[PDB]
Amino acid sequence: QDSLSFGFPTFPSDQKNLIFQGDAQIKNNAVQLTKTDSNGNPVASTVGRILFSAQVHLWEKSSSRVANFQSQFSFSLKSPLSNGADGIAFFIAPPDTTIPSGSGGGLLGLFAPGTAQNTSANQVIAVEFDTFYAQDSNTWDPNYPHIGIDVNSIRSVKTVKWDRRDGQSLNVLVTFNPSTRNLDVVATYSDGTRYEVSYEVDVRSVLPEWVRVGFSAASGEQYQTHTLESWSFTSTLLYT
Amino acid sequence: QDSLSFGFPTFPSDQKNLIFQGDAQIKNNAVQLTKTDSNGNPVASTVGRILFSAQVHLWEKSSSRVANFQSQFSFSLKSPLSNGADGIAFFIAPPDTTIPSGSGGGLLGLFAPGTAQNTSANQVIAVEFDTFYAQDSNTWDPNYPHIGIDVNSIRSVKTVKWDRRDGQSLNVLVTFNPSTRNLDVVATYSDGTRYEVSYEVDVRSVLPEWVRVGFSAASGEQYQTHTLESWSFTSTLLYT
Ligand SMILES: OC[C@H]1O[C@H](O[C@@H]2[C@H](O)[C@@H](O)O[C@H](CO)[C@H]2O)[C@@H](O)[C@@H](O)[C@@H]1O
Ligand SMILES: [Ca+2]
Ligand SMILES: [Ca+2]
Ligand SMILES: [Mn+2]
Numbered sequence: 001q002d003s004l005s006f007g008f009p010t011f012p013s014d015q016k017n018l019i020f021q022g023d024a025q026i027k028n029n030a031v032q033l034t035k036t037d038s039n040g041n042p043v044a045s046t047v048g049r050i051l052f053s054a055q056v057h058l059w060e061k062s063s064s065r066v067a068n069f070q071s072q073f074s075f076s077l078k079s080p081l082s083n084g085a086d087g088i089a090f091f092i093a094p095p096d097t098t099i100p101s102g103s104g105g106g107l108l109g110l111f112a113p114g115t116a117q118n119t120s121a122n123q124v125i126a127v128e129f130d131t132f133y134a135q136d137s138n139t140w141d142p143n144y145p146h147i148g149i150d151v152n153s154i155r156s157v158k159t160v161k162w163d164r165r166d167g168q169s170l171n172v173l174v175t176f177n178p179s180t181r182n183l184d185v186v187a188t189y190s191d192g193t194r195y196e197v198s199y200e201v202d203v204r205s206v207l208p209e210w211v212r213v214g215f216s217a218a219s220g221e222q223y224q225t226h227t228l229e230s231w232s233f234t235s236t237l238l239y240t
Numbered sequence: 241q242d243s244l245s246f247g248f249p250t251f252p253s254d255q256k257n258l259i260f261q262g263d264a265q266i267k268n269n270a271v272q273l274t275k276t277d278s279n280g281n282p283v284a285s286t287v288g289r290i291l292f293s294a295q296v297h298l299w300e301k302s303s304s305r306v307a308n309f310q311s312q313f314s315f316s317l318k319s320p321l322s323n324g325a326d327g328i329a330f331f332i333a334p335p336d337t338t339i340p341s342g343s344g345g346g347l348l349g350l351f352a353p354g355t356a357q358n359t360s361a362n363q364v365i366a367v368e369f370d371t372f373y374a375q376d377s378n379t380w381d382p383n384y385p386h387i388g389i390d391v392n393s394i395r396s397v398k399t400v401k402w403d404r405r406d407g408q409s410l411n412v413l414v415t416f417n418p419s420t421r422n423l424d425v426v427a428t429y430s431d432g433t434r435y436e437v438s439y440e441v442d443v444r445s446v447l448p449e450w451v452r453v454g455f456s457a458a459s460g461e462q463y464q465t466h467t468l469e470s471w472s473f474t475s476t477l478l479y480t
């Protein structure tokens with residue numbers, strides 16, 4: 001299809017079009033990307049991701065078209081600790097993507113340790129909401145919580161200072177305009193606090209024509225729940 | 241997802257989200273549901289169907305919601321014969337639906353001979369464009385080409401006279417309004433000729449909560465090409 005759109009206002013347990021990887025599962029009408037115990041508390045050493053089953057036609061060499069896309073979603077992070085880890089990310093990757101071995105903790109379930117910073121060995125675009133930045137283990141991170149745009153590397157090409165708020169839902173709008181090639185990210189808390197980050201990227205040189213979209217999250221030694229509450233997505237191939 | 245939509249203005253050979261069954265295949269940016277030889281001419285004894293891979297949430301018990309959906313599509317039929325057969329149909333069925341054994345010819349690849357007219361043995365809603373009505377073989381048909389609404393039986397719950405036009409595209413809009421429970425069908429040729437037929441049906445009594453949508457066509461001893469040229473579909477769950 002030249003166009004595709006879907007909307008999940010909530011996430012009932014009766015799911016048919018979601019690919020669950022790692023510890024991800026539906027609980028209380030929301031997707032819990034990382035593992036939790038019986039009491040519902042987050043646990044250490046867990047990775048989880050979800051992908052929508054239908055493949056998205058991001059670009060078509062045949063007609064020289066590139067798709068625009070808009071992903072809107074909300075999530076909340078909760079933890080008994082003051083420094084919850086590691087973060088959640090919206091990502092786009094080849095259809096057969098799977099959790100790389102050893103991609104836990106700060107690698108957010110998106111990159112393999114040995115090639116996490118090698119841009120020629122990866123095929124992924126992600127928008128991360130990173131809450132852990134200790135320089136001993138996350139040497140690639142700025143020294144503060146942040147939102148970042150990742151293009152084939154865990155070391156973001158662009159970041160913006162962000163504030164983690166335990167239990168509060170963050171509303172996010174990610175849009176890609178093929179005409180300007182700008183990937184824009186706008187995130188806001190209910191009180192109006194807004195964060196914005198943008199980057200120019202030619203998706204044709206990073207990803208294959210058909211891709212899958214989804215979310216990934218992980219917790220290493222530090223932990224927090226990564227609860228995806230809602231998600232809507234739309235893409236349309238355009239000639240610019 | 242509560243809502244899903246996709247659009248195929250045309251059908252390029254590079255498909256990822258279509259399930260091809262039988263002889264269905266893409267040729268010249270269109271779906272040829274029934275087999276054609278090297279020259280593109282129709283042949284006898286062929287059946288083919290396509291389904292969109294993502295499952296559609298038609299209704300939800302827990303929330304008492306039912307989907308409002310619309311399916312717009314265009315097709316053309318061509319045959320050197322004076323009595324091209326057998327017809328094409330848009331259908332909705334359980335996700336694991338496959339071509340029934342012996343469902344060729346007048347059964348349009350949708351029903352098995354033994355239970356084709358047993359409403360308790362089937363789970364399918366289809367809108368058929370039936371071009372073959374020989375009273376000796378297709379005993380269930382009115383004596384003329386017709387558009388029919390099929391609910392669990394090859395014997396349409398209702399039909400309207402229709403004119404088959406060789407090589408001309410027919411544009412069809414099929415919609416279902418959960419508030420009135422009306423399934424409406426409007427079909428038009430490029431010269432303004434219009435056909436309309438409606439039927440009140442509670443889809444919850446006929447189909448499971450999750451279903452797949454697609455097209456089916458077949459040719460028995462008589463034949464014609466059944467070319468699906470374009471297709472767009474949208475569905476959203478509504479209170480009810
Ligand atoms: O989950 C946070 C973090 O945990 C693990 O690294 C640890 C932290 O840097 C901190 O707790 O100090 C530990 C001792 O130096 C260190 O192991 C990793 O899983 C890391 O990837 C993750 O970001
Ligand atoms: Ca980090
Ligand atoms: Ca017939
Ligand atoms: Mn980071």
Ligand SMILES: [Mn+2]
Nearest residue numbers: 370381388396
């Ligand atoms: Mn009929």
